[PDB]
Each structure stands twice: as C-alpha cells, then as structure tokens.
Amino acid sequence: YGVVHNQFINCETRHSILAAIQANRHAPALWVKQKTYTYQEMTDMALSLSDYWHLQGVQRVAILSVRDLAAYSAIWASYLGGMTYIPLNARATTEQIQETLIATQCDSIMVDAQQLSRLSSLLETCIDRLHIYALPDVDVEPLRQQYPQHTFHTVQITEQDVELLVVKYLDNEHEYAYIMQTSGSTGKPKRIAVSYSNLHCYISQIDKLFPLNAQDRVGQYSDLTFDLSVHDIFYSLISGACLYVVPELAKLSPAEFIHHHQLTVWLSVPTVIELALQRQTLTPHSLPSLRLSFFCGQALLHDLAEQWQQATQQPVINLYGPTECTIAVTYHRFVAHSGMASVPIGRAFEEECLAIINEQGELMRFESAPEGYRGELLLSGKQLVKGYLNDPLNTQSAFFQHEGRLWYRSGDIVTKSNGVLIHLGRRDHQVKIAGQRVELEEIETVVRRVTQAHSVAIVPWPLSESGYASGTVAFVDTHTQWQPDLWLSQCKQQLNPTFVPKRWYAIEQLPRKTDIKALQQQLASQ
Numbered sequence: 001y002g003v004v005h006n007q008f009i010n011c012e013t014r015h016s017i018l019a020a021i022q023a024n025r026h027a028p029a030l031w032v033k034q035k036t037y038t039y040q041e042m043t044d045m046a047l048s049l050s051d052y053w054h055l056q057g058v059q060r061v062a063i064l065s066v067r068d069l070a071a072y073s074a075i076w077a078s079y080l081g082g083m084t085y086i087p088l089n090a091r092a093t094t095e096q097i098q099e100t101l102i103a104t105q106c107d108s109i110m111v112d113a114q115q116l117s118r119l120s121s122l123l124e125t126c127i128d129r130l131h132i133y134a135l136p137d138v139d140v141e142p143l144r145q146q147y148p149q150h151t152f153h154t155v156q157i158t159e160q161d162v163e164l165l166v167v168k169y170l171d172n173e174h175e176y177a178y179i180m181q182t183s184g185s186t187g188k189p190k191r192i193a194v195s196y197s198n199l200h201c202y203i204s205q206i207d208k209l210f211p212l213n214a215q216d217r218v219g220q221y222s223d224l225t226f227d228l229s230v231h232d233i234f235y236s237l238i239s240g241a242c243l244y245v246v247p248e249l250a251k252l253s254p255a256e257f258i259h260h261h262q263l264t265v266w267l268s269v270p271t272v273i274e275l276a277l278q279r280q281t282l283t284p285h286s287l288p289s290l291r292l293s294f295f296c297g298q299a300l301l302h303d304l305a306e307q308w309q310q311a312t313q314q315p316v317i318n319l320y321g322p323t324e325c326t327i328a329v330t331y332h333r334f335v336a337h338s339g340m341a342s343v344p345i346g347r348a349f350e351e352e353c354l355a356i357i358n359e360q361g362e363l364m365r366f367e368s369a370p371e372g373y374r375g376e377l378l379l380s381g382k383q384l385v386k387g388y389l390n391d392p393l394n395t396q397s398a399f400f401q402h403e404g405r406l407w408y409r410s411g412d413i414v415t416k417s418n419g420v421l422i423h424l425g426r427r428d429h430q431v432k433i434a435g436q437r438v439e440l441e442e443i444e445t446v447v448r449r450v451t452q453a454h455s456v457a458i459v460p461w462p463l464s465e466s467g468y469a470s471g472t473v474a475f476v477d478t479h480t481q482w483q484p485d486l487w488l489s490q491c492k493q494q495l496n497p498t499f500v501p502k503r504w505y506a507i508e509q510l511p512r513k514t515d516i517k518a519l520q521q522q523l524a525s526q
C-alpha cells in the first residue's frame with residue numbers, strides 16, 4: 001500500500017430535517033382538527049405523494065386544501081421531494097385560481113373533501129387538463145365521472161422506511177421551494193418564488209438563535225398563503241416538534257387556543273395581541289406554557305409587547321422582513337426596560353445583509369452607518385429572491401446591482417439608533433389590513449373600474465389604538481351614479497373580502513396628493 005499524506009472527499013439544513021424525522025418517528029408531528037399524526041405517519045403520506053409526483057414528472061403543485069391534513073401532507077411531500085408548492089387563497093375565486101395556475105404553469109392541484117365544491121367550479125371552466133390529487137379518504141369518484149376532461153389521482157399511502165430517508169433523496173438548492181403571491185398596484189398579482197437555499201438559510205438562522213426540542217408545541221396560526229406559515233411548518237419539522245393547526249373558527253381566540261393546547265411556541269402578526277386584550281384573556285401569568293413568542297408583519301408597540309410578555313413571563317421576539325427576502329431578515333428581543341414607544345426591528349441574522357439609503361441617495365452598509373442614520377432599508381444576501389416571477393418591470397424597479405451584490409428596495413423607512421433599526425413607516429401605500437399585505441392602489445384601481453368615478457380614495461379604517469387597520473373605506477366623488485350595492489357585488493369578485501371597502505362615501509372634494517390622515521380624522525368625528 002502507498003503512503004498517503006492527505007485525503008479530500010467532495011445541504012446541512014436539509015440533513016437536519018431528515019435526521020429530525022428519523023429521530024422522532026414515533027413522536028407526534030401534527031395536530032389538526034382533533035387528530036394527531038406521528039412523524040412516521042406524516043412521512044408515509046408525504047413520501048407516498050412525493051414518489052407518485054416524481055413518477056408523474058410533476059414539479060409544481062398548487063394546494064387548494066387549507067387548515068387540513070392534506071395541505072400539510074402535500075407541503076412535506078413537496079419539500080421532501082424537491083418540488084415547488086403554490087398555496088391557493090382560501091377565498092380566491094375560480095377565476096383568480098385559473099390566473100394563478102396559468103402564471104405559475106401549474107396543472108396539479110392537491111385537494112381535500114372540504115374543497116370539492118370550489119374544485120368543481122374550477123373544473124367546469126378550465127379547458128386544459130388538470131391533475132387532481134387527494135388522500136384515499138376523499139371520494140373523488142363522482143367528480144371523476146363528471147369531468148373526464150380532467151384526471152383524478154388517488155394516491156395510496158404506502159409505509160416508508162425512515163432509516164432510508166437520507167439516501168432515498170437532491171442537489172438543486174436553486175430550484176423553487178414555494179411560490180407566493182402578493183398585491184400588485186394594477187390588480188395583477190406579483191409572484192415571489194423562494195428557492196430552497198433562500199428557505200434553508202432562514203430556517204438555519206432561526207434554529208440556531210432559538211433552538212427548539214421535540215417536546216415543543218408549535219402554533220400554526222397564519223394562512224398558508226402567508227410566509228409566516230412556512231416558518232411555523234419548517235421550524236417545527238427541523239425540531240421534531242408538534243405543529244398545532246389553528247382551526248379557522250379559533251383564529252379569533254388565540255390566547256384560549258394557546259392555553260388549551262399548552263403551546264410553547266407562537267408566531268403571528270401582532271394584531272393577535274390586541275385581539276387577546278379585547279377579549280380580556282391576557283391576564284398576567286395566564287400563558288405559562290408559551291416560552292417563545294414571535295411577532296412579525298406590523299409595527300410592534302412596546303405596550304402591546306409588554307402585556308403579552310406579562311402573560312407568558314417569557315421571551316418575546318420582534319421579527320422583520322418582506323416575503324421578497326424569505327419571511328424575516330432581522331430580529332430583536334423585546335426589552336421591557338428600554339423606555340421606548342415601539343420595539344426595534346433589531347439587526348440582521350447575518351452581517352453584510354442590510355444597507356440604508358438616505359434622501360440624498362447615499363448608500364450606506366449597516367455596519368458603517370452612524371448613530372441616527374435614516375432612510376430606506378435595503379436587503380441582500382442568501383434569503384433574497386432573484387426578483388419577481390416573469391415580471392421584469394417590477395424586478396427592475398425593486399432590485400438592482402451594486403458593487404457585486406444584488407440589493408432589494410424594501411420601501412421601509414428606518415433609523416439606526418443605539419445599534420439597532422427602528423421601523424418608521426413606508427414611502428408608498430402598501431399597508432396591512434387585518435394583518436394582510438395589500439397595495440392601497442390595487443383597491444383604488446378596482447374601485448375606479450367598478451364605479452367609473454373620476455376621483456377615488458381608499459382609506460385604512462377603523463384603526464385600533466396601536467394604529468392597526470382592520471378594514472378599508474372608500475370615498476368617491478359626487479358625480480358618479482350612487483350604486484353601492486352593485487359596486488360591492490363587483491368588488492367581491494376582484495378583491496379578497498378583507499380588502500373590500502366596508503363603508504362608502506360620496507364626498508364633494510378630497511383633502512390634499514390625497515391626505516389620508518385628514519380623511520381618517522373626518523371619519524373619527526362620526
């Protein structure tokens with residue numbers, strides 16, 4: 001034998017997930033609608049779907065099922081199999097779903113028994129052959145007979161050897177893991193495709209800063225169309241923890257849900273705190289099981305975070321980031337003794353990811369920016385997506401190159417204070433309405449079309465004490481024929497119900513660019 005001086009042999013996060021599944025095969029992985037499923041049972045369903053899709057040559061699967069076993073089965077199946085999932089909004093119309101399938105070139109849909117009625121309306125008008133997937137408990141026979149122009153696949157659940165998990169699998173970290181959609185100013189949705197490496201970077205950051213163990217119980221509050229749900233699902237999975245799906249009819253009682261199931265980990269928009277306070281459920285020490293509370297999506301007010309922390313007596317974490325940069329990109333542990341009015345959004349998981357550009361147009365890396373520096377936050381790094389899917393115009397305006405790396409204009413205005421970022425607002429009219437992202441211009445565009453009005457303003461209203469808007473109202477000019485029943489009827493076909501204006505005003509003149517605050521002040525007077 002020859003004497004040898006050296007040897008060299010040619011995804012860590014994916015490995016951790018596969019290992020977690022093996023290590024906790026007999027443990028509960030998912031609770032949904034009064035049923036519990038172990039890691040082994042979820043693995044059997046997931047790899048059965050995944051194997052079948054591989055043989056079918058499916059890459060993208062749309063998911064119509066919501067808050068149901070079939071949705072989580074398909075999401076695990078897509079992840080384990082290196083495929084791309086596309087969650088469909090629970091209140092999307094037939095037409096909106098068609099637009100999504102077309103834009104994402106997807107002809108495969110995972111359904112369940114609760115969605116068969118919506119599916120039927122889709123199948124009725126879609127001319128192209130769709131491939132419909134369901135678990136064996138779903139009776140697809142009548143629809144199969146009724147729609148031979150489409151194809152229905154019942155996938156049998158085979159038992160799967162979890163010992164084989166690590167070798168039975170994938171080497172395109174740049175393939176898309178999921179595709180989200182968000183509000184576009186013209187009513188055409190922007191689509192955001194998030195890669196495996198985007199997702200793996202995020203999960204690895206959160207797992208190392210805030211590690212869970214297999215005894216943890218993770219809430220799944222957010223809709224699957226909102227990327228917070230991606231956090232819930234994969235955070236639980238990498239930890240071998242149990243994910244608890246919040247039933248639709250319990251989203252309005254979050255504190256009771258947490259206490260009822262003794263949840264140890266929670267993530268939602270901070271509106272949830274206000275709601276819990278309104279229902280008189282947030283008394284001190286009332287939530288002892290909740291050891292990690294994350295909030296993302298809207299400005300976290302100090303007083304809100306304080307009241308939630310008194311209930312849990314445990315850490316509260318502010319998370320910030322847009323869907324375009326994979327869930328959250330900064331974080332800040334809430335400090336009760338900060339004496340500030342809002343909770344900072346903090347600092348990035350990874351250094352060299354943030355820059356601020358001021359009104360002069362000077363780009364400044366976060367590490368170099370001085371105390372008090374102010375301007376628009378720019379994002380970069382491994383969590384940033386390539387741009388918007390098939391939308392070069394929006395990509396060009398939001399994404400740009402600068403000395404080697406791709407930066408993204410968040411639109412968020414921040415200040416650097418005492419070494420952390422404070423979120424001050426936005427330069428545009430993107431807002432959250434009841435916790436959901438929307439462009440006020442998308443609503444205005446729809447209302448303009450439907451009313452044919454010359455002048456239109458969309459105003460977030462009413463506002464809570466924290467400044468969170470639960471709805472919108474519309475102002476139209478006094479020259480358009482007043483037909484608010486007809487207007488309402490048409491808006492519901494073009495906007496999610498959350499965004500449809502709940503109150504309509506015919507007003508002689510708008511206060512002035514439209515002064516949204518003045519309209520808010522006026523509305524407060526009645």
Ligand SMILES: Nc1ncnc2c1ncn2[C@@H]1O[C@H](COP(=O)([O-])OC(=O)C[NH3+])[C@@H](O)[C@H]1O
Binds near residue numbers: 227
């Ligand atoms: N912790 C926080 N504080 C203040 N604003 C936040 C925030 N987290 C998110 N936002 C706002 O939400 C926008 C992104 O909304 P989104 O629906 O794309 O994604 C999320 O909320 C979490 N991925 C950000 O650009 C920012 O305006």
